[model samples]
Structures are given as structure tokens and as C-alpha cells.
Target: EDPQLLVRVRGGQLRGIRLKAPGGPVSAFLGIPFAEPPVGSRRFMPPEPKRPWSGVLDATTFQNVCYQYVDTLYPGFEGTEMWNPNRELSEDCLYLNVWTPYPRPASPTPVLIWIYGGGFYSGAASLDVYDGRFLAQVEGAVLVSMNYRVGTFGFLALPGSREAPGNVGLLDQRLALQWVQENIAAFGGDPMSVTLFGESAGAASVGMHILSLPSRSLFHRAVLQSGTPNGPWATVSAGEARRRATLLARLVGCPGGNDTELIACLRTRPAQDLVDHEWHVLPQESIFRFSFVPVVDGDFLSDTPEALINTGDFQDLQVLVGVVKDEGSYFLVYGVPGFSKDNESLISRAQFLAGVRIGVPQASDLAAEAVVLHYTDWLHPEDPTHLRDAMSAVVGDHNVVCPVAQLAGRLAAQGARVYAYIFEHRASTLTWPLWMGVPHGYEIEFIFGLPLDPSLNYTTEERIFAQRLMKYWTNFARTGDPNDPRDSKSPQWPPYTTAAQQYVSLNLKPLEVRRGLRAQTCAFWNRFLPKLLSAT
Candidate 1:
């Protein structure tokens, strides 16, 4: 075995070592910390640098994930909450895993930082799907997986609290990047040449990170996976966050958000108890159930997300951004139902609130029509001209497709080195019905090189798909280019300029899909956004 450095953690002397890259024989370490555990007094606050250790810290196995459970519908979900053989919810969850292909420190390679997405409530880099061996070996670039405060810990901004508004997660993300800036060279990566990439909340987090003052030089580029800048999930206000926090905290008998009390109270609560308590007042599908969001508290974020993109706040970085053709698959599956067979179904308020969030142009009527028309086309094709509707107009537009595409086009217009893609590949494995098609997070398996992991099961065809996806992703991670030089799918890919709205559609074959799969739907929303605002 080759030699590597060691660091001391609270428990024992932690060991950190380098692995020989399979793709190019380069090497790097794994599961290194950028910050001390934000437990006890530190929970719900910004992150602090990791305390220096006395000796070598063991970096062999993965550390404990954040103290939260996940929805059951996910593929390969291990149910870390109820099913975890070791059931404990400790606050010592702030950790990062790094994978660099280069073994020696003679030359510095570009860095790629990853943020996983789980609607701000649950997710971890240690998840089996995010394994980075293939990404490190094949791309020959350093890859990092980081954990940030999630749910109440990350997105609480009560009026009476002493902490700043919602965005502890963003702070954690920045602190992790700062760690990379300070220590990546030791791991054979160039801190100056960095790219921040993520899916859903992670992608949105990258967008917000770019807008943050502390992250100006943290990364040179970014890749957004199916992230929406114009959606309710993308933009949050302190007032709204505060209201939600008050309601949830009250249930736990923990008064308003006095930082210490909330942390102490919630941290000690059982994970299932907390998650179940949440599910009691609200079903998992209720959009309100997904309320722990980064608030525009003027501290972490200033205005709505689109404002930053429109003002060129994130114009400098090279960018690769896009969504799946049916970005709504997950929403349709797990989100507040728009077409439920149940008797007490309702999405009207959700739609109206969505319109208000979009602002000025509520566009509820048109957006609602779009949702029913498209969903009906799929779920209720036989119910012709059935005036019956499940959602309000706002809910229709802001949920998935319209908001994401609109934001992507806006970001591209800001003169970024943008490349976009729409993943249309539907996995044949059929783990469940909710995975309607290439679901929201389906792209990650291939791009992150998880298929190569022996721990995960991938069909031969899935393996090939993973290879093609890697070629495309690696090309971007290496250069500010996503069009793989070796790909025969299309011509030399051009940057996502306003003139060339070129985006590769990932399907059985990678081809250039249309501007919008839901063109009629978006056109309707665009027209109604203004109308909804006026009516409201």
C-alpha cells in the first residue's frame, strides 16, 4: 500500500489514504472533513472549519449520514432511518468524501464538487448511487461529495431566533468549497479550476452558491441537473420560511425559532418521530411538506433566484444546465397530486400559491389547463373534454417543466458558456410505477459513473448507457465543453447561446430534442402568468 497523510477526529485517529485510479492510475483520498460537526450549539448555524487533529484520522469507511430519512419511492433506497441496523440520529454528520484520479501532487487537476438533491429534507453523498470511482478514474478529475444541513437544521428562519435567515445549507456548501480551496492541492486537484455541479436542490444550491459573496472564486464553472430557477422550490422568502417553521416547531412543543431551543429539541427527537410528526399534519405529497427551503433573507440570498440570473450575478462562470423531458415524473409520483383517484384530492391552493410565487403574472388559468391537458393525455386519455381539474393554474406552471426551462433560457441569455441537455432515457428495470419515465434524478446514475460500482446492479444495456453518459460528462468536467469529441450523436456542440438553443436530448440515442417538450403548455403558462397575477 502507498503512504498517505492522517488527521485526528473526536473518536480516534482517522486514517486518510489515496487510491490508484483505475482509468489512469492517478490517486486521491476519501471521506475528509472540511468542517467540525455542527452539533449542539453549532447546529442550525453557519459552518466552522474542522478542528485540526492530533494524529492520522481513519478514512477507510463512510461516515454517518445526516440525521434524516428518505421517501420510499426512491430507487436503491436503503431506508437509513427505520431499517438502518444501527439506528441513531446524531448531529455529527458534517463530512465530505473526495476522489481524485491523480496520485501524486506534481500536477494539479481541475476539481468538481458535487451536491446531492433531496428537496432540502433528505439525501447523502454516501448513497450507493453517488459512488465516484468511475468519475475519478475515467474523468481524471478530482470529484468531491459534500453534506450540508438539511430540513429544519438547514432551512429555518423564525422571527425570534438569533440565527440568520434560511441558508445554513448554503453556508455549509461554501465552507466545504473553502476547504477544497485550502486542501485540494494536497489531493492532486487545482482549487482555482473548480466546477460546482448538482441535481435538483443541489443544482439550485449551486445557483445560489454562485450568487453568494463568499463563493465568488470557489469554483470556475457549474453544471445544473434538472434544476428550476423559476419554481417555488427554487425561490423562498424569509417570511414564508418563518411561517412554516413556526407551525412545525409548535407541534414539537418547541416554541418559535430560538436557535438553541429548536436545535436541542429537534436534534434529540427521534428521526422517525420527527418525520412522522411532519407526515401527520401533511401527507408527503403536499408541497407544504417540502417547506425547508433557502429563504431570501437578505443574508444568504437577496431576491428571487431569477433576479440573480437576470442581473448577470452568475454570468461569469461556464455553465451546463438542463432538465429531463418529463421533469414532472417525480412530482407526479410523489408531489401533491394533480390527478388523484382519491375523494379528498386537492391541488388548487398549491397552484394559486405557485402563481403568486411566479409573481405579477399568476398565469394560473393557462398553467392549470396545461397540467390537466398533458397529464390527462397520459393518465386520462379516455376522459375527453372532461372539465374536471385537479390543480389550480399556479401549481401547473411552477411545479416542473415551465419554471425550469424558463430559468435555463434566461441563464443562457446572460451570456454564459452554457450547454444544456434533456435526459429522455427511461430505465427498463421498472422498479416502481411512479418512475413514470426518466424520473427527476435518473440521470445521476450514469453521469457519476455509479454503474461501474460492483455494489450496484446494472444491466449490460445500462452499463453501455452509463459509458456514453460518462463520455459526455467527462468532456464537460475536463474543459468548459459538454459535447464529447468522440460522440457521433451530433455535430460539434455549440455553447448554449441565445442564437443556438442547442441541447442534447439523452434517450436510447442522444439527439437534439426540441426547445420544449411541453411547448403548448409553456406557451399557455407564459400567457397566463401575467393574467394570474392581475386576477389575484
Candidate 2:
């Protein structure tokens, strides 16, 4: 293999490398600058477009990862948390990677731009788990992923403008899209046929772009895995964001001053200082909640996602969104480690949910009982086994599944092409028995065509399921629908509608298509909860 692969883009000549995939050779253009580094004067500001370069630039290595704390433990048989970047972490992280089977194709192919999810706090394109070579090879498509700032640096909304308008990371993603629209043709990708897809926070981001004006012309389709903009963790109101920013400022010794002064102090502080300091804005009990999240900046996000989706105010685009059977199980193990079969842990979880310290106020006793009736079989209310099981289902459904279902229905009602799914396949016990059901993000590996690890010696049926899933995903990207009748392997994925509510049930044994799936739970959240859990 040659060490150098050159492609002339709008900016300049980029020198990439050709990597060998299982199927065939693929070109990898790693760490290409999509925007000017968001550092120093540009800190907390929207991404600025990259300036034209004078000559060929090296794009063989990944750029610095966006600054975030090292939290998820990996390479251990202990937890469900997957890949974490071991690359150089820094503020100068506005870079993207591209993988294309056809570096210079006879014709432009479809594109899928991936945005990873880490609660909107930590994630990078540099993670090996996100390598796009296999997907590109299998799908005959161009793949791209980018690093956006996260945590306080990415999402800081002050009461007044002090040079930081917030949602800089989102802006970074938008800029990357613009870069793709302008330059992807250089790497054999169809900019007009782009599909924006992601998991968790990244999925929420795709929804945000669908609703935002800056992104309308950049991508034509989206795939949201276990998340949407309307989810509780996705976006906070302006006031809430300011409150968190104020708390952050106080911690960093820039409290009670003009916005500009505080902004300057924060910019002067080291990136490690920002990453190291813990902000006490979110409840310690909830792993789903984050101190740093997308803010409703008047420009980027004019209103709450609920309001936008309700009024049919977003761009009409093809969308595929879904959730795992037990999305919250991963957080249970990751957030509250050492969750043994104990009564105290169960009670603590109950207390955390009921506490008013977080945004959610305590429910009435009757209401609490009503919720418990749906979740638990532990008559004692602290029967460790039943309590843990009930809580896992409750948290997973409320946080990820219900919200995604709501978004899919709304988008379908609003006349967008939509497909919904439920990932319920259980893993091999040898993989990691942290939870009983498929946890959040468990499908990401399968979607990306990544091989099962040694520990996850999956059944033959499970392996076939992964291949089918990859095809369905890539088929959606190629066209607008998952069921390309041309591909006999694809299950008949019916479009989701207000009338049908049909969704694909993904598993190994046999792919089943069902309607009104989880009807009661969804109805409870969609119709009943709005009246019960009021922020008004």
C-alpha cells in the first residue's frame, strides 16, 4: 500500500491513506480540518469555516480529541461501556474523518455522516470502534465522523451575550456538514444524498439539525438511535442553561461579574481546569441528566423541541429512529457501580427519583404509587431484585424509548418519511452480563459492522442479525427507506405513521414487524404524563 493518497478539495490538496478492509480497499482521509480550531479568541464561539490552505497537508493521523474527562472503563469484562479515545485531547478538536471505498468513483455515492453520543459531554471521532472502513466497504458508501466540543465549553449559555452564544458544538457540527456539502464530492460522496445519523446525544443532534435552518440543505435524511431533541437530556431552556453556566463560573473563580469578564477568565483557564472541576448543576442520582447539554439559543434552536415537533415546524426529511429494549441498564452499572442485589441500593434509587433537588419535583404519593404499580412487583418496595429490574425498565423507557417513539410519531404525522425500530436482542452472557436486556448503544457496534469481541462470541443467528441490520441501515442511507424491495434480505420495513405506529422488532431468531408496540407505555407517556409532569 502507498503511504500517500492525495485528493484536492475546496481548501487544498489533502494527503490521506488507503486502508485495506475485509471486502476491499478503502481510502481513509483522517483528521481533515472542517473548520478553524475553536481555541483562544474563538473559544465558546461558533465554529469559523476553515481558511483555504496553500498546499498539500498531511491527513493521515487523527486530530486532538475534544477535551473531556476519562470516565468509561474499557477492555475489562466488568462493564458495558465501550470505546474511549486514548488520543491527544485538546480544544483544537474541530476535525473530521472520511472513509470511502471509492476514493475517486465513476459516480458519486451516498453518504452517511455519523455523530457519536456520550450524553453530549464526551465523545470523539478518534475512537477505533467508530472506524468506518467496514461500513464503507459493505455499503459502498462514504462515511464521515467529526469531533465537536462537549461539556461546558460546547454548551454555555449566559443570561446576556458575552461573546458566547452557546451551542458552539452544534454549530461545529453544522459547519462540518457545510464542509461536506462543499467538499465530499472530492472523495466520491453525494452531498445531496447525505444521511445524518447518531446514537443518544448525537441522535438528538440530528433532530436539532432537522429543525434548524442552517442544516436544511446539507442533509436529506436522518437516523436517530435511542434519542431525539425532545428527550429530557437533550436541551435545556435558556434560563436553566444560564443557571448552570453561573454555577460553572463560580466554581472557576469568575462568579458575579459581567459576562465578558467571566468569559475571559474561563478562556484563560486551562482546558484541564474546565474538565477537572465538577459542576453541581445536575442531580447526582440521575445518569441520564447532564450539566452540559444543548441550549435553546434563539438562533440555533428557536424554541423547545416539543413545540417545534408539535407544530410541524421542522424540515421534511426521511428519518429512522429507535431504542434498545433496556436503554437505561448501561447507566445503572456505569453510574451506580457495585449495584448488588441489596435493599439499600433500591431504596436509594427510589429516593433519588422522588427527590425535588433535581428539575423534577416529587410526585404525589398516589402518583408515585401509580408509577410503581406499572414498574415493580416488589411488594416490599425494596426487594432488591424486583426493585432493580423495575427501575431499569422505568428509567430506560422514560428517558430513551418513549421520547424516541414520541418523535417518530410526530415526525410521521408532520409528513416526513419515518421508520421506527426496537432493539431487544439479548447479548451472549459471555460478552457482559451487566444487564438482562440489550443496553443503550449496544446496537452501535452492529450498525457500524464492527466485529464481535472475543468475549462476545455471539451465536450464528446473532451474527446474521448484525449483517441484516447493517444492510438495513445502509439501504436507508442509499435511498430513503430501509426495505429496498430489491434486497430480498431486508424485512418489509413499513413506514411509521400516526395511523399505523408500525415498528421493526430487531432480533436474531426472526425479524418481526409489529404495530402499536408497547402501546400502553407509550400512551401513558404521550397522553397522560404531559398533564402529570408539568413544568408550567
Candidate 3:
């Protein structure tokens, strides 16, 4: 029981544990509640602050993770098991974890707050991959991660109902940030130096926070990896959210006549029953979309992300946003039927066209035909492999890569300090096919310094690369700039602008600053496709 490990937060005194790390000893304060349990009447509602406690709260072990249906997209796949939550599931899961260098730094260190990604359906801060020990001890920064509600429990929107509004998951995040601002100094972290970061839906949530006026002042910098607020699957329309909520209620045998009765009936259903029935709300063709997601609840989100960016309604802050080279390969393998990791055979041209139609459902039939033609390889139009490659490109660009590029460009256009990057290095340990180059969420390993752990079996090169990548991230957290003059060996990471469109390429070799990532394809999505859709 070290006195140094005891800290008094707004709620009460917390006794954290100290663990030995490769770099040094790290202080870990796990499962500290920032909000009250979102149970009973509080379900699907904004989080309430956790009440103050009497005695010293034991913050040693991780507590329950918010209840979620365990995803088994790729049965027996190692990657599938790697991400599944390994904690007890419960509604009482509004807790956070903090990691800082032991003996407390002389001055408040910069804070790097992480939001885990699982398409906003499943994720836990207690996951081993997100352990903040290495980043705290080795990188000399304070790391914080919080568990927020996901799936139907988090995103179900009942219009005009005081009981349930949309985007309670985002509100959970906002409340956690508020907690950080009020109490991070006690853990030796500078509140003003907070850098909020996440991946996939988590990245999209970060983007939402940037557009959200109430959330802007809570954090100073942002990192968005492989997602943006404008992504088609990120946020649903209020009508769609209401439709999904009503569908789920009907599936669970609940009354849907009135908003108040629907929500009250939902609260009576077992949590697992609600989660099990929620997926049926999505049609087979819209498999890529989550059944429940954040909606444009006029309160938190004022308007569409595109309108917000165009009208300059977002926060102007230092931002680092990027995507993996093959963002859609993961989705294609899991979400798209007839595409599997074991199948090397190429899809037919017919299959490719059908895929285009399904993926671009919002586009007119003529626009879908145009998309197919644009992506098809003219030289080898009949080649199955070429068609397969084209489909991957189309899916990747439409969903993740191009959306991210557009967001980066728009943010830079608005005078925000933006630095963009494309993750190109594929892990040697992955069993995925050679064509699946750096699939979505793969960059998280290096960013979290997972390779630095000797027991993880990462190669020496990977470990070294992880060190450099972690440095770039921590450097950005400390100062807005990602480069330190003291490290003369590191390359200068140029800021992204509309004119230059320059971005760094993160890989095993020396980092290279590149220009115009998927320029033509992005233009088709960001400029041409929108105009075409509008005209039709």
C-alpha cells in the first residue's frame, strides 16, 4: 500500500495498484466509476455522475463490461478471439482506467485518452490490447480509457421521448471527458493537454465530438483512425433509428404504440434478450450497417456532418486523422457473403456489379452502373482476380478510406492543424491472405505498443517500429507537433493542407510523406458521386 498510489478524485479516494513494466513501474487505477450504473430507468438515457463514496475505493481489478452480444464473425479465427471482451458483462459498467508513470511525474504529463472501437457494438477498455502500461511508462504520458455502453443499450433512439434520446453512447464519452477534466490532475496528467483518440466507430465518435459544440472544449487535440463522422454507416437518420428501435421492440414482444410505453416495456426485457433481437432490425442487404447507431439528435448533433463541416460549425484544433490501406478487406471477408479468407478464387464480373449495387444503395441504378464501370479494370475486365480487386477497392473507398480522406481535407480547409497518414505495414503474424493489406484496426497494435511486450511474440522489427509509432503519437499528445528536434533521426511530418494533401506513410521502413492518397477515387466519392446523386 504505497501512499503515492492513493489519490482523491471527485467521487472519493482511490487506492490503485503499481505494476512493474519494461520501461519502469507504472501506476494502474482500474475500474474507477465516472458515472452511475446505467440500469433500470437510466437505461438508454444520458449517464448520471457517480455519487461520492465514503471509504477508499479499491481500484485494482477491472469490473464488468457493458453487456453486448459477443461477435463471432470469423469462427476459429485468431483475430476474432483477440478482440472479444474478456470481462463479465453487466449494465453497471460505467467505469474508467488510468495508467501513469509510478512515483508521479514532477509536472503534470500530457494525457492520451483512448476510445476503443468495435463498430459501436462491442468494446471494453479492460481488453488486454488496450492496456495502458507501456504507453504510460515508456512514452512518459498519462493514458486514460473508459468503457461506454454499446449496441441497442447505447444507441436506440425513441423520438419525442424524454426517456430515451439518441447518442447516449456519445454522451457517455462526453461525461468521461468531463470527469477527466475535473480529476486527471490528481493522477499527474495535464487536463489542457488531453488528446482524444480512437479507431473505427471510436474514430467516428471522435469526429462527432469535433462537430459537437458541447464536447469541443473538453479536449484540445484529436486522433481519428480509419473512420469519420460522414461515413454512411456511422450515424443513422432519426427516422431510421426510430424504425430500428420499434422493430427491436416488436421482436422482443414489447408494445410500440407510444414512445413512453415502448421504452418502459424495453426496460423490463432481459438485457441479453434485447441484444439478441436487435440485429434482426437490419435487412440482409444492409449487413454492413449496425442495427442501432448514433442519430442526429438535434441536441448533441446540430446537423449532418457534411453541413456542419461546410458551415464551419466544428472545432478548429490540431487533428491527426488517417485510415489503413485496406480498410474494407475486413468488412468484405465478414460482412459480404460468398467472400471468405479461405476462398482464393475471384468473384465473377456479375458478382462485382451486384456488390456495387448493394454497397451504393443510396445511388440511383445509373449511378451504381457508373460506379461499377469506374472501378472495373478495362484492360482485364473478364479476369476474376481483377474483378475481385476492383470490388475490394470499391468497398474500401466507399466505406472507410475515401470518407477519411474527405474529412481530413475538410478539416484542413477549415484552418484546423491537421496531419494525415496512411498505415501500409501489414503485421507478419497475421494469417490473412496477402491481398488483405493492413486491414482495418490492425494499426492499433503498434499505436498501443503491443509489440513491446516480449510475451506477445512480435518480431524485433515490429517492436522497433512500434516504439517509433508510439513516439509519434505521444509526441503529438505532448505538443501539437508530432516531431521532436531532439530526435534528429525522425523524419519531419508535414501538416496536411487542401493544396498539398500531404500525409505520412507509417510502415516498417523509414516513414515517407506522400501526397494525394486515392485522389481520383476520393474525388469520385467526395465530389463526383455527390453531384451525380444530387442531379438525379
Candidate 4:
């Protein structure tokens, strides 16, 4: 309170930045909002501007969480989808938090903004696991974390919810970035140099930014931390989109009617009820399920997300894209405190993953039985279905691994400067042998700066790994290249180019590379799946 830290913005005044260097005049300012809360009528729409403020806005507390639809999750934060009892779920939430190294009036540092992942249904910038303070102060980079709508509030695509449009979460992010472009200069950060970064769904949203006409020229660089553009709705056609929307209407009590009637019903329904049903479109066959991923509507997203990139739309941007060493194995079922092999637990997952039963025909009893066995069969292998389990990998490849590499390959082919890495060091969790190594969103620890998770119970080696990991991440933000042979204690990180296609294989020993473990799977996915599925 000596100098009374405060930031004056066109919209509002914020006060609470605890300076990094004490006794001396403060150097940095943190925790500022760029938009008004996405609550109430703004619930499902694009972000509204922050109401202009006459007094200093208090920056003391992190904003309350955007409403999350997750009713369950996996074992630990190293994993995904645990029953997070602490989440204060709601529909109206849009906020962003910032962290800047002590600001020097002369030296406006580079800005690194973070977007967290929740499969487009859940995630927050304030994730206990993703504290960005350490990354900023340690690396001398300014960090910003933010809140975006999730579930129906974020991706609600029905004819209703017109107050908010489809891809509201995405629009919300664009608005936040627009704010950063305009306002970051005040924090002693170069607004022009701001880099957008996120993992999983958050990363996918970042990917969308590169494709968006609105987001073009807003941010300078993007880091896709283990994410691509393959939401559940991406594969569906217009008729299917309507069917999904029709199901949504019925779920909200306006079944089988004109779009206007359905929209009216949605408007009258409680926001939570309508939002809760957002996942009415996913295949009920998944192991765990989430609804409300980015949709592939013809307007905003013109084609299958990966296809757009493959056709060379977002090929010109600088991309830092990669997966963790073992990504697929991470989001598996771990023991839940209240769950056991009981009637309730087993059946809970059936409806849980199977979804709200969108009009997609039910999987044959045999097919459903087969899929359940494919994933959970190892638990009781009296009649081991390793064959089905292997096929499940095909499913994983079709959906995730293949898409990740395809984007990398596509980017490299277009002569875009792209770097890819894989996180290899396995966490001490069920994903050990089961998940192999890096699970979805596993690399968050290094980039977002949350070093210690009480749940994972990490060891000394993990701590040291995180230290080096943070350096490589912030270094990438500072310079496009992640590997600085001189500064990085690790190996040389070669840039990705068409002829070389070299990228960083991020593991305990991060190295540059041309191809990854799944290079063959790449062709198998891009070429084979469409042919095979179409023939069937």
C-alpha cells in the first residue's frame, strides 16, 4: 500500500498488484479483467465489454469459477475428470487473470496468456494445478489466465440461446485476447508480442483462433499444448446438427417442433437445465463423456477442423504443438473414493459415457458390450478381449493421436514454422503402464507453472523435471524456438520445416525430431479411417 498499486483502464480501475520487488517502487501489476462478467442475459452470448468504471477495481481475489458441467473425474490432477466437489458451477462467467514480472517503465516485457482445457465443457484459468505466477517471475514473462464459459453456456448451438450465439466460449476467448491486445501495454508488456497458449480443449480453441477471421491479427503466436480441432460435432452434417438440436429441444421440453418454438422453449427453461443438457450430441460409447465441445458449423468453422488446416488455412502461423510421451492412457478410469464394482458404479458409467442418447442409433447390444469390454475388460480378463482393446487404440488413433500428427504434418508441409514435442516422463499414477506416459493436458505443469500437486505425490525427479520444463516453455514464449542450446540445459531444438519436419520430442531428455512414435498411425488415420468407415 506504500505507493498504492493500481492500474487505470478505459473500462475500469484495478487495485491489488502486490509488487515483486519490495521497498523499491513496484515493477509489475496483475489480476485485471478485460470484460464484464458473462452472467445473466449475457450467459450464452459473446463477451460484453467491461462496464466503464469510475473507481479502482479490487484485484485481490481470483474470480469465481465459470460453471462446470462435470459431475465426475479420474483419480488425480495428473489425470482428468475426477468428481470435483469444489467446483462452483454456473453459466454466467467470463474473466481473465494476469501476472507480470515487476514492470519496468522502460522495459515492457513479452506477454504470455494462458487458456485452460476441459474438453470444451470444463476447465478454468485458476486451476489449482495451473498457477502461472512462477512462470512469469522466474522467466521474466508476463502471464495471464482467464475464465471462459463451458458446457451449454460456451458451445450451446441450438436455434435458441440467440442472446448468445454458437461458439460463445470461443467468442469469449477472442474478446479476451482483443482486450489483451489493447491493454497489455499498460503492464509493461508489449501487446504486439502477446502469445496465446492452452492445452486440450483450450489448445483446440487456440487452434480455432488461427482459423478465425475475427481473431486474425489479434495475437502474434499460439502454443497448442496437446490439442487439435476434433470436437464431437465436427463430424456431423447439417441434418445431424438439427437432430442434435432437436434432441436438445426435447430435453428442454420443446421436442419435435419448428426451430422458433424450440428456441422459445430453450429461452424459458432455467439456464442451468438447458446448459446441463449440452452434451446431448456425443456418442454414448465413450469411456467417460463430456458434451459441449467446439461445433463445426459451416459459418464459424467451415470444415472438419483438421481438414481446414490440411487444406492450408492456418498454415502460416508459428505453432508449438506436441503431445506428452503417453497421452491416450491418461484419461482412464481410476478408483474413485465412493465408487466400486457395484451395481451403481457400473451402470453410472453406461449412461455417463453413452450420453443423453442422441438420435444416433443405439450401438448394438453386442457392439456396446464389446466397447465396454474393450476398455474395462482388462479389469477382469477372465475372458481377455485384448483384440477389442487393440481396436480401441484405433478409436483413439482416429480421434486424437492421428489428428495431432496430421496437423503437425500439414503445418510443416505448408512451410509454417512449427515445433512439436512429446512429454515422456510418466507420472506416478494409474496412467503409468495403463496410460504409458503423457496423458491429456499432462504438460500443463511445466507451462502453466503449478509445480506441486498434493494428489499426485510427486518425487524429487519430478520436481527437477518441472524446473527444466518451465524453462523450455517460457523460452518458447520469449523466442519462437523452444531449444536454446546455450540457455537450455537440454539438447538442440531444431525448427520444423518442410524438408526437415524436425520438432522437439519433449521428455525427460527433450530432443529435436523428424517423426514421432505414431508417424505411421498418421497415414492410417487420415487415409484409412474415411475409406474404411465409408465402405462400411
For candidate 1, the TM-score is 0.82
Which portions of model 2 miss their true places by more than 4 Å? 1-4, 72-81, 313-316, 334-369, 378-383, 429-431, 434-436, 452-460, 488-491, 534-536
For all candidates in order, the CA lDDT equals: 0.63, 0.78, 0.86, 0.61
What are the per-residue Cα lDDT tens digits for candidate 4 across 1-536?
Answer: 52435666667677756643221323334345666776655655677777777777777666666776554443445334432424465554566777666443458777888888767667776665666666666677777777888776676665233543377788888888888887777766788777888887777888888776778788878888767765332234444445666677677778365655555566577766865677666545353345555666666677666667767655456778877654544343322221222212222343323421221123444434534443454555432233223333534454466667777777778767787776665555433334233456556765554443334466766766777777766677777666664763556776666556566655555454544637655565467544645665
Highest TM-score scorer: 3
lDDT of 4: 0.61
TM-score versus the correct structure, for each prediction: 0.82, 0.91, 0.97, 0.81
For model 3, name the residue pairs that clash.
none
lDDT of 2 at 376: 55
Worst 10 residues of 3 by lDDT: 282-291
Q: Quickly count the clashes in candidate 2.
A: 0
Off by over 4 Å in 3: 313-316
RMSD vs true structure, all candidates: 5.5, 3.2, 1.5, 5.6
lDDT of model 1, residue 109:
80
Pick the lDDT winner.
3
TM-score of 3: 0.97
Q: Model 4: runs farther than 4 Å from truth?
A: 2-4, 19-32, 73-87, 103-106, 159-164, 230-238, 255-261, 279-283, 313-316, 334-392, 428-437, 452-458, 485-489, 497-501, 510-514
Q: How big is the RMSD of model 2?
A: 3.2
